[PDB]
Amino acid sequence: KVFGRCELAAAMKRHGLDNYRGYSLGNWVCAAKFESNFNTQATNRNTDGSTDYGILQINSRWWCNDGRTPGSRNLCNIPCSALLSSDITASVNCAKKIVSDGNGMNAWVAWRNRCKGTDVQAWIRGCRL
Structure with missing residues (x-):
């Protein structure tokens, strides 16, 4: 499934990610955008x-x-x-275990590279949450 920006924001909120471990909902939507471009079926092989x-x-x-x-x-x-x-x-249940691991959201390179330090709230503006 390819989620639309607001549809995902709604779903992550319902699953308790807003402010989980100190990260507002926008961080999570931003990480999903640059990690998989909102696609549940994306996969990537590494070296x-x-x-x-x-x-x-x-x-x-x-x-x-x-x-x-x-x-x-x-x-x-x-x-x-x-x-x-x-x-x-x-995915949300496992993400919750990863972020509790001591390095926060640095576990996601795309979040690290493209979301950290930006106005991540942009990702939830315009949505009815």
């Missing part, structure tokens, strides 16, 4: 054999198990395919 999955591009080396990644830790305890669902629940 180390891992793959990034779904709307928040969660990596198979530390977080989910895809059965083909050397060094897998599966810290969210979930199959990587559950993160490609049109329902963002599994």
